[PDB]
C-alpha cells in the first residue's frame, strides 16, 4: 500500500479478532487477549457506507425501452437507431467498469492509512516507557496491569506516573 | 406462466434490487441498467492475509 502498514511492517492479520477491523492484542500476568478499537472502526464504517450509497445513488433506474420497426426502404433510419443504441450501451459500460476499478484502490488505501494512524497514536503516547520491537509491537519497561492497559487503549495514559 | 413480477425481459423476469444487469437491453417495468460486463464487485473490507 501507499502507507506501508498492511503487509508492510505489520505482515499479517488476526483471525482471533472477530468484532472489528483494527485492534490491540495485550499480554501481562493476568492473561492475554484481543480487543477491537471502536472509534476507528465506526469512522471507517461510516465512510464506506457513504461511498457505497453515493455509488448507488449516481445511477438512476431504467424505464421501459423497446425497439422499433422499419421497412425495406428505410435502411438509413434503422442504421441510425442501431448506432444510437450501441453508442449509449458502450458509454455506460465504460463508465461502470472504470468507476468500480478506481474506487477499489482508494478503498484499499483507506484501511492502510487507518492502521498507520492507530500505530502512531500509540507510539506518541508511550514515547519513552516502552521499546519498539518492529512488528507493530511495544514492550513496556515498568509493570503494566489491566488499569494501565485500559488507559493505553483509551488515550489517557499517564506518562509522568511511570517515570 | 402464472406469476408476478416488476421487471420483464424477452427472456424472463428479474427479481433484484442491484443497480446493474447483463441479461437483455430490452426491458418492461422498473429495471436496472444494462451493461455488457461480466463481473462488477465492489470492495468494503481490507486485504485478507490470514495465517499470520
Amino acid at each position, epitope marked *: 500500500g501507499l502507507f506501508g502498514a498492511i503487509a508492510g511492517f505489520i505482515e499479517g492479520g488476526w483471525t482471533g479478532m472477530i468484532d472489528g477491523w483494527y485492534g490491540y492484542h495485550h499480554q501481562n500476568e493476568q492473561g492475554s487477549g484481543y480487543a477491537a478499537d471502536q472509534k476507528s*472502526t*465506526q469512522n471507517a464504517i461510516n465512510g464506506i457506507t457513504n461511498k457505497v450509497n453515493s455509488v*448507488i445513488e449516481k445511477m438512476n433506474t431504467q424505464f421501459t425501452a423497446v425497439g422499433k420497426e422499419f421497412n425495406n426502404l428505410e435502411k438509413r433510419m434503422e442504421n441510425l437507431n442501431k448506432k444510437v443504441d450501441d453508442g449509449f450501451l458502450d458509454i455506460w459500460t465504460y463508465n461502470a467498469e472504470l468507476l468500480v476499478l478506481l474506487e477499489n484502490e482508494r478503498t484499499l488505501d483507506f484501511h492502510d492509512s487507518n492502521v498507520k494512524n492507530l500505530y502512531e497514536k500509540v507510539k506518541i503516547q508511550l514515547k519513552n516507557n516502552a521499546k519498539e520491537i518492529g512488528n507493530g509491537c511495544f514492550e513496556f519497561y515498568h509493570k503494566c496491569d489491566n488499569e494501565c492497559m485500559e488507559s493505553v487503549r483509551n488515550g489517557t495514559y499517564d506518562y509522568p506516573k511511570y517515570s | 406462466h402464472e406469476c408476478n413480477t416488476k421487471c420483464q425481459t424477452p427472456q424472463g423476469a428479474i427479481n433484484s*434490487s442491484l443497480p446493474f444487469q447483463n441479461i437483455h437491453p430490452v426491458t418492461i417495468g422498473e429495471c436496472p441498467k444494462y451493461v455488457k460486463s461480466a463481473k462488477l464487485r465492489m470492495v468494503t473490507g481490507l486485504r485478507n492475509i490470514p495465517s499470520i
Partner: antibody
Amino acid sequence: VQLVESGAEVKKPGSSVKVSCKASGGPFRSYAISWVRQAPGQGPEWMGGIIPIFGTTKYAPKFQGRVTITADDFAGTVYMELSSLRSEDTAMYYCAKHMGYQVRETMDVWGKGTTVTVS
Amino acid sequence: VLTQPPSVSAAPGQKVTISCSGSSSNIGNDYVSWYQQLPGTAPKLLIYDNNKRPSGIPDRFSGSKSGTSATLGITGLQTGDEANYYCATWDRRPTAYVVFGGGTKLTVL
C-alpha cells in the same frame, strides 16, 4: 431515521411467521438493528439483533432455536422469522435502532409496533 | 436480573428517585440505560451511559450508579410523567444479551 414494520398478522399454533422492518435513508446503514417483544401487561423482551457489515447475528438464550434474523442491504429491509408458534408468542414486536455498529443496550429509535396473534 | 420498586407515589412538584439494583454479573461491570413508556406507545430513551442525556430531553431527568445499583431522579414532577420506567444493561458472561428491568409505576397525586 424512520422505522416501519409490516402489517398485523393472526395465525394458529404450530406454524411460523415472518415480520419485516424498513428504514429510511440510504440502503446501507452504519448501525445495528434489534427486535424487541412486549406481551400485554409485562415489560419488554430483547430477542436478537444484527450487525451492519460483518453480518453477525445475536439471539437471546431463550429464543435460540426458533428465531432467524436476516437482512437485504440493497433493499434496506430486515426480516425476522419465528418458528413453532405457541399460544404465548402473542405480543407486540418492535424494530429498534442502536446508535453504533454493535448490539449494545442503548436503543435510541423505535418503530411503531405490529401485533401477532396466535389462535 | 434487575429488580426495581414496583410502584412509586408522590405529589406534583416533588422529587422522586427509582433504584435499579442488580448483581455483579450485569450491573457491576457495565452501564445502565433508562426508558419511559407512556400507555399505548413505544419506549423512549431517557438516560444512557449511566449519566447522559440525548437531544430533546429536559434537565429534570438525571441518573447515576453506585457500586451495584443505579438510580434515576426526576425533579419538577407534573402530570405528563405518568408512565412505566425500565432499566436496561448489557449482561455478558455465559452468553451476552440485553436484559430489561421489571417495571415501576410512578404515581402522581
